[PDB]
Amino acid sequence: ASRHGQKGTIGITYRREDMPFTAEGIVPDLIINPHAIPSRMTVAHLIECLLSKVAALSGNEGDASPFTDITVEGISKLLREHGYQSRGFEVMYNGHTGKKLMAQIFFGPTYYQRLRHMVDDKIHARARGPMQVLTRQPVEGRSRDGGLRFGEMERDCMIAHGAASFLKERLMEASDAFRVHICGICGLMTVIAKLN
Amino acid sequence: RGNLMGKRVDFSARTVISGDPNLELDQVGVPKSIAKTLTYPEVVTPYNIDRLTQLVRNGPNEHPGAKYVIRDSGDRIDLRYSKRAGDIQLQYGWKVERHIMDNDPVLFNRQPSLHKMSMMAHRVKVIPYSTFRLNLSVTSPYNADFDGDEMNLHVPQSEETRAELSQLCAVPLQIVSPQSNKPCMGIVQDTLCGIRKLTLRDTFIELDQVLNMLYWVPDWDGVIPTPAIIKPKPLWSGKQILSVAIPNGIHLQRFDEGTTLLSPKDNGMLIIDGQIIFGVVEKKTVGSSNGGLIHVVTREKGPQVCAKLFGNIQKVVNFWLLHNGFSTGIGDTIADGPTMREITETIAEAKKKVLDVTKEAQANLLTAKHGMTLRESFEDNVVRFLNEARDKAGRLAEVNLKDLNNVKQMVMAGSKGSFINIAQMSACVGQQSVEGKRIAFGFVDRTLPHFSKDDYSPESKGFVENSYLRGLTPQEFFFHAMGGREGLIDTAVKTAETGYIQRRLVKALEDIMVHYDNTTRNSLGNVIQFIYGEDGMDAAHIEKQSLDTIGGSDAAFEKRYRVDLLNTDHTLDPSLLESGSEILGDLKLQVLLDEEYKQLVKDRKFLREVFVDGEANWPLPVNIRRIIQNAQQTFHIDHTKPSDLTIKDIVLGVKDLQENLLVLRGKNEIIQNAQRDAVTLFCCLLRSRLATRRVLQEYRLTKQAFDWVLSNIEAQFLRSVVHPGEMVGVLAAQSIGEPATQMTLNTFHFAGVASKKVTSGVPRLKEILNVAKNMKTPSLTVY
Amino acid sequence: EEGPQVKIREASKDNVDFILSNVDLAMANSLRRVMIAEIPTLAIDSVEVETNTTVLADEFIAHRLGLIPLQSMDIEQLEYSRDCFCEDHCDKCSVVLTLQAFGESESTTNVYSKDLVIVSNLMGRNIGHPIIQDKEGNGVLICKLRKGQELKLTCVAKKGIAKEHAKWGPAAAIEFEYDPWNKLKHTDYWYEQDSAKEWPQSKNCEYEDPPNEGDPFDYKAQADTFYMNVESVGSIPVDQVVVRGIDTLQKKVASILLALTQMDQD
Amino acid sequence: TLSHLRRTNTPIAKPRQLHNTHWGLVCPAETPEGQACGLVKNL
Amino acid sequence: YDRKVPSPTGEYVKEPEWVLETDGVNLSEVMTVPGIDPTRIYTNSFIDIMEVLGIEAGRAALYKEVYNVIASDGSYVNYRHMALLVDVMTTQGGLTSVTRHGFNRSNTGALMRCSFEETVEILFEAGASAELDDCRGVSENVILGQMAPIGTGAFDVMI
Amino acid sequence: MNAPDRFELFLLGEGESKLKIDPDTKAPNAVVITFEKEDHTLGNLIRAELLNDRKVLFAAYKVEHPFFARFKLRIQTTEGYDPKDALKNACNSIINKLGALKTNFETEWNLQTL
Amino acid sequence: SNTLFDDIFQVSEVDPGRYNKVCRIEAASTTQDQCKLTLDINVELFPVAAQDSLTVTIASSLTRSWRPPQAGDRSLADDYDYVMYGTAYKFEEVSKDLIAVYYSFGGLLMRLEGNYRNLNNLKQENAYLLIRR
Amino acid sequence: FDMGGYFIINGSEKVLIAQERSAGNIVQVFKKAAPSPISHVAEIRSALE
Amino acid sequence: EKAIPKDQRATTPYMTKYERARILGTRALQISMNAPVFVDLEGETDPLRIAMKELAEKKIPLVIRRYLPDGSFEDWSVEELIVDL
Amino acid sequence: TTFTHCEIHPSMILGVAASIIPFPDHNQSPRNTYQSAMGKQAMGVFLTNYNVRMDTMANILYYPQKPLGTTRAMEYLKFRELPAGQNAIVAIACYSGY
Amino acid sequence: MIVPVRCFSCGKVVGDKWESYLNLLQEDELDEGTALSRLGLKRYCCRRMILTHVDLIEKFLRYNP
DNA sequence: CGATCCTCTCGAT
RNA sequence: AGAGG
Ligand SMILES: Nc1ncnc2c1ncn2[C@@H]1O[C@H](COP(=O)(O)OP(=O)(O)OP(=O)(O)O)[C@@H](O)[C@H]1O
Ligand SMILES: [Mg+2]
Ligand SMILES: [Mg+2]
Ligand SMILES: [Zn+2]
Ligand SMILES: [Zn+2]
Ligand SMILES: [Zn+2]
């Protein structure tokens, strides 16, 4: 995540060559999508980037303080002084093909954070395992090797589909299921059995 | 509640989800480790014996391999430890718990499961890396973001459990939603953005590219279409190569605004056979739109056929855009110097207008209407002038934005972003509101201690003059923050509310299902409805169609439907009918032309009495327009030649077609009458559409083509009917529930306003569902 | 000489600036990819840690060691251990370096790439001597130690391509530009009021003829003449980055030519 | 850490809303989303 | 309030009319007021319409009101869904609430009414009045771990 | 954890050949060469060279999924021209093009002093 | 066949309108007092100035996959400057015998109006457009 | 860089969370609405520090 | 009993989503359990795909007992039932 | 004009977490609140003695960088002394659509 | 936490320029930007690498065992 | 007498 | 409790 409430998991990794590049031979370490800026209104993210770009070239810190008199204009002024197109943009080439991109890319430094919770600490899978003591159902938690809760919400979801058998199976064959002995007279579970 | 209604289950999966431009819509990327953990009991048949023997040999740690061989007499031979795992000579009847391999059916989900589409059968595609991979166009029904979402997976264990998944819950099956009778999935993000960029008239692609693009479409005839340009460079239009992803027999037509048959602005839509003629492809065409390319392909060509289309469109568009590229910078926020001066003066004049009304109020001259205070009327005026200000300044921004403005580019495609975003980011944030009213006096007679007492000015009561580009002042900041908090709070309120409303609705309608008599009955077998929806039609099979006998002047109505063969001017001439002259003054055929006209006028009234306001467009099964347009193209309709139908053909044809549009089957009184009613509305449409004059002068149909239109209408209608066993109760409960819960949780964005709803809203719907004796706004509207 | 033409403007020990005339984009680009990835180099690919009383983790140290650039001159006469017959590694497929350092001084003791020592018999090959471009003679700073600390370890440097781990890159950045005047109209420059005044014009504008304002667009023109600058990390000299670049690309084409001939029998 | 050390909890008329009076005393941003929203404050 | 009403020429046209919006209810007494159209008079108190005009009108105002939450928000839900709920609430003679009060006290199952609320109190009243569970409802079969008569198990397969 | 070995990018597996030449099912005189353990460094280069052959009707390549080092090249040639040849010729042409370049760069390098 | 129409038109208006490579051109025939024209032109490969004399031809000749031209000895029905391939989409009959045509040259649009364009266009999803000088 | 302010209880670091309450001895008047016999109420929460 | 006669059957002559799904289900269950195939499998190996072919050929010997709310039932042959869908 | 006091600096209305955000004054109200909850889940040097503590879970960034863009408040919160992220070079682009 | 060898983005060896960088600032009394440039650190990815580096090792070393 | 879903962590008696 | 979407 960037410093502006911009959460995102890595979708893919590309090695230097496949990545798009500047005619300086600069390449990104990261690629965020344009479709996460207009609705988010993280305008500061853009200013942050631009400012950090200036900062890296100038070799000075960025005054990202809030009630500053620092403007996009004043920054952009300096970035052009530093020989780059003032509004963050840069001409880039497609790494696969080598051809110039029809679009110029807003590219530069942006402080990004490595957050806790990683795929591998999250992945779980179960197919028969630790069954609960009283309830006789799969246990809770990935650590315990538990079964995932198929809530009422999910039962409802299946009733809507008209998936009668799957629902009975998902609640018997998988998870629970048991075989009791009932009286033809009183109709209760008080039937003693010598199964041999 | 938790051990019987809900349970924890085996054969379950779940992990972080990621997007896949190279996956099929109906597919799910299953990480190899997961594939290796989840099993499926496969009985040993001679059809499989060799594939299974090989799997057993591969073992638990090689992928296409299993764990456990269950023979007859219980006995679980465990492949990971067994001293015999090496050999194993399988016998028929024995089961093999093999790993979940490619193309298996699985039930994939995302919580909250407040929607039939939050649960969908997917085709497995075992993959490397640890995320569950999915096609971007399945994002919406699940309500997924790739910011960390988790998504669960469930494995069917029986052949009949697998059939249920693949024949009922399949992703392609679930394309057309029965909630909004419109389709739930469409082209989103990059693909939506790029499709627009590619469909530009200005967009021209060379051979090298063309060829790559063409090979990229997996169906592809293997035929290079002729370039639009054969002048000093063989150049292809964007529209052209994308039309390769569009299958033949696909007919689509629009007309947006300035759309003529020449659309100089390149708007609307025209797709004949399976090629775009004009109009830029964007959200209206390729989105979740009711009259979109998707609703059309799914209905006309099939669901599997349409699901395949998503893929193709993405494969070309994505590639083209991988090569075009698309960014967004701070640059796309900086609007003109001369434009800023206009925005600035727009705010200035609103601010002075406000000072004036205030000075007028302070002179005890401002006199409120009735029903409200001088103070009450004062605020809403000031509130109005200030919103009007932001909106005007916002449009000033929007208009000044170039065609190259990446934000304008996005809203233009409808890929992401709205007007308000432009407005806020670049021109003016706006007035902040808490509990409806603008920032109140937290401090004594002031909103902050940087202000004097009794200051009702825009800035003091939370009006943010500045844009996110310009920045906000501490006061503006704190006020924005105050209003911002409102959103976060009401999510944490309304979501716990809406969600309860959901379970209640769901429990209250669980057992309502269509029976084997079109009757909607519960567990007790009590009649709730005598026909589902009052028409015994399946919601998925319905779409908004215009009723032409309801609207227009009696003059225009006459011009359109009336045919007097006994009048030389007002009869149909022999240019549009073989029998034309042979029919002037028929008397016997004028008796049929007259009987037709009276039913057409009987409806005109009837419809004006049901749809009192005169609303033409109503959701009805069988899109007649498409059927007509289809026949025209299918039979390559020679608009210059007359025709081969008689008044007797068209009149008794439409007349008999209606006798055969079955919903109920009984030969008795009530049942035949129930059936007669069930169809009333559709028949108006049918008659309004298939009246004599309209068939000949307008559609210019042939006998061959007409006969087919009738058979197509009859068949389509029959398909459009509700299936007994449809769990309409749970369905309705979720169809009302899902929107509620998502009108919040969203919840937000932004801070201005977006209420009514939260506010109107979930408390009202709560009043209604609870049957609140003591309502909050009891109103009486007298006419 | 017949086809593609090279014109070196600038050249140094670790940087070459040139022009690539009479070539297709695909070739220019494919060369740039093969220069980034596909060229083999020598890099530490196994650290065996005897002692580590430094503030740094074992793996954290191992990681840096891998990145340390070392002589890849006679790298074509060292085998990929994968295809060497030895059980594990040997002298024909690997280079064995050693590191022993002990903070003995009261001041902070610095460990440099200069402090690694070859123990493998090189058989007179210019290979695995930690490349030192630093003025003062010390290499890369690997670690630091207090008066107490000790770090005793062994390194096996092996043959490999960047395409497997970035450490194997004889790489560094490659500048790449074609048509500094957008005569090709191969990109649509974003602007507010003026494309020309807003975008800063290239160093390579001097080498080409500026458009012609009121002249027709060259529709038939094909992108040719590529302005390039190849930077060496140090393992292989600059000339060799591009010479081996050309070579290995030429090689994989030849394997694909030879591949066809094998399917040709049966 | 520093942030944890400067936390506030308000157990149970409009307690969640950012009041005017919070100016300069409480952080207007810092607050958890849902449940403890506007009850858990940071100085 | 503007009105879509037909011209003498035949076409529908905007003809603005005077309407009175009231704060408070007394439908009964207001409609008997002269100079008003008592055929058109409306209230958001659908409970009062149910009382003054009868169940069928009550049903209408209830839909009018359900629809109005949904649409006076942005969204569109197909008539039939909202229509089903309104019918369920109605089809009994009066207004049956979507709460433990209304639908949960209804003549339904037993094991199915304890799936919602007051779980033990529903189960005790069952053991007191000696209730017979039909085992028809969805919720019943869910507890029983049997295939319910839903879509797939609605019919019966034979040889 | 569920990631593949980085050598799977350039090392051929169990059995697995570099080129798999399969006849095109659709249009005539066309074929689909699946290049195993390869990227855009080879795909694009062979493709662009094939497009210079004024007897090759169609020539395009795609990399169906990024996880895998493998590409599909489609070739359609004129009647009486085997596409296998069109490729062979293309491959050969590239080696020669590169030959000159090596020789040229080499020449120029020697004339340069630093 | 062969040809299907021929005339010399003189440009009235020239409009880019939010486009760069494309221009919608409005013209009339030098011969027929009624004959109108409307056309989207790739003003980048063939620029059109205000009031230009240009020979407009609509053929149907010189189904089956497109082969790269490769000049060789294969001569197409042109010694023209601008060539396009379209599809018939409507044939709007106006006053008297005033017939207007409708063609899409891959989204680039045509609208030729007149009188004598009878057994000359016959709804054919074919037709090529040719411009001279 | 540590700042303290926490406790170490059975080897674990403990933050004592600042608890919010309404100040006492404060005289506040409330309007009691519609289903109520009393229109307004004047309250005081008297404490002894 | 109750049993509605073959004459007078007001239920859809068209197979429902659910009937198709349960039919294909049950048949795949039998094929998977080494039961006989009544259709010339065109090199087919999947029990559902085989059931699919059997359905198209209408060589599935199963009968849908359609229950009505009164308790009565209408029985229909998988082969007599129209399979549009 | 009738002033009795002046603010020491408005930047001070914020607390520790929000004091970390660059240009919060150019951000949509909630986005600011989000980053506040977020920055508390970010890795890097939590204390110098990390190598010396026996604690359940400890995540430390290999080479943490100080931000190129800083608030003045940060100075007091010792951010550039004990950082949370790295100054990645980031392109905003529609690339492989991954 | 010691000057990384090689710049993440481009790969130019940066693990040798550190002490050198500190002399330029301390002894040579130069400014950051000019000093960065003086070390041949042209690109911004190479610039940030050294500029934003916080060398905590010095602090860790300080601990007595 | 009810007050959304699922998930994951640590570790008090 | 604390946290995630
Ligand atoms: N308390 C909750 N209960 C149920 N579902 C929740 C809850 N909080 C979040 N969600 C679900 O997950 C999503 C969480 O919001 P999320 O961060 O993914 O998306 P967003 O509104 O688009 O904002 P962002 O801009 O950060 O992506 C919701 O939109 C909702 O489906
Ligand atoms: Mg998201
Ligand atoms: Mg999310
Ligand atoms: Zn008994
Ligand atoms: Zn060896
Ligand atoms: Zn670098």
Side-chain angles (χ1 to χ4, degrees), chain C residues 120-136:
Chain C
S120 165
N121 157 50
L122 303 180
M123 286 130 58
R125 278 170 302 200
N126 200 11
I127 223 153
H129 310 273
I131 103 103
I132 296 155
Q133 279 165 332
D134 162 281
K135 181 274 236 69
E136 300 80 18

Side-chain angles (χ1 to χ4, degrees), chain B residues 551-729:
Chain B
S553 60
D554 312 315
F557 178 95
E558 207 115 329
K559 163 96 181 180
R560 218 229 231 95
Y561 305 103
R562 187 54 174 150
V563 169
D564 196 83
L565 308 163
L566 323 157
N567 185 332
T568 184
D569 331 313
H570 301 259
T571 190
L572 19 92
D573 91 284
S575 70
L576 47 126
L577 192 46
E578 236 128 68
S579 54
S581 271
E582 181 217 76
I583 239 60
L584 231 163
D586 211 274
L587 285 87
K588 289 179 89 184
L589 296 189
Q590 246 283 292
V591 108
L592 269 172
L593 220 326
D594 275 354
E595 73 103 307
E596 154 171 299
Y597 197 72
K598 187 138 254 174
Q599 200 56 38
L600 277 268
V601 316
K602 226 191 83 180
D603 299 347
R604 158 66 159 237
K605 176 195 171 183
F606 170 78
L607 295 168
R608 275 169 176 235
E609 68 202 5
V610 39
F611 309 100
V612 154
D613 70 322
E615 179 39 60
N617 333 279
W618 289 91
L620 299 125
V622 195
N623 186 276
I624 292 164
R625 193 166 134 265
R626 282 193 285 99
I627 302 196
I628 306 305
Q629 292 166 158
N630 282 13
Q632 296 174 267
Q633 211 281 137
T634 308
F635 300 90
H636 317 100
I637 239 81
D638 197 18
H639 280 259
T640 175
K641 236 170 99 183
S643 99
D644 55 335
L645 319 85
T646 329
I647 292 345
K648 292 223 255 172
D649 289 31
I650 309 124
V651 174
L652 311 161
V654 69
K655 209 175 181 187
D656 206 84
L657 166 64
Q658 37 206 272
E659 301 284 28
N660 287 285
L661 299 157
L662 281 302
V663 145
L664 289 124
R665 229 77 41 167
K667 284 179 172 190
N668 67 82
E669 325 286 90
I670 24 273
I671 302 170
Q672 275 305 317
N673 291 215
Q675 163 61 46
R676 252 205 316 95
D677 294 308
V679 297
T680 297
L681 203 57
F682 179 52
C683 289
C684 300
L685 175 83
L686 187 72
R687 290 177 234 144
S688 104
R689 256 81 141 91
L690 303 171
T692 302
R693 179 91 94 187
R694 248 215 150 170
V695 167
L696 279 53
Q697 230 220 110
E698 293 202 354
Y699 317 147
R700 312 193 57 80
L701 259 267
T702 79
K703 173 65 178 160
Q704 194 204 13
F706 184 92
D707 284 0
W708 179 85
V709 155
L710 264 56
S711 304
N712 243 259
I713 278 160
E714 190 203 40
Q716 267 243 62
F717 179 79
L718 293 159
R719 281 180 245 140
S720 287
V721 164
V722 75
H723 281 228
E726 254 281 67
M727 293 307 312
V728 294

Side-chain angles (χ1 to χ4, degrees), chain C residues 61-76:
Chain C
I61 292 152
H63 177 61
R64 324 197 94 231
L65 295 166
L67 291 119
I68 289 164
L70 32 73
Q71 195 62 78
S72 287
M73 251 300 202
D74 299 1
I75 238 287
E76 290 316 327

Side-chain angles (χ1 to χ4, degrees), chain B residues 7 10 51 114 229 241 277-278 315 349 374 411 423 493 535 546 560 577 581 603 634 674 758 766:
Chain B
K7 285 178 174 73
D10 305 305
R51 181 186 45 93
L114 35 74
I229 277 165
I241 82 87
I277 308 296
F278 69 89
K315 298 170 229 281
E349 65 185 49
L374 303 307
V411 316
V493 166
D535 69 11
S546 188
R560 218 229 231 95
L577 192 46
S581 271
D603 299 347
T634 308
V758 56
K766 205 222 168 189

Side-chain angles (χ1 to χ4, degrees), chain I residues 31 41 48 52 63 69 82:
Chain I
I31 298 152
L41 47 95
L48 171 111
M52 238 130 76
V63 253
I82 314 168

Side-chain angles (χ1 to χ4, degrees), chain A residues 7 40, chain B residues 110 112 143 145 147 149 745-746 748-749, chain J residues 31:
Chain A
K7 315 103 186 151
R40 304 279 151 85
Chain B
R110 204 273 212 204
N143 192 352
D145 312 267
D147 61 43
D149 295 27
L745 217 19
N746 215 303
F748 148 104
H749 329 84
Chain J
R31 247 71 220 112

Side-chain angles (χ1 to χ4, degrees), chain A residues 183 185-187:
Chain A
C183 175
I185 319 304
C186 67

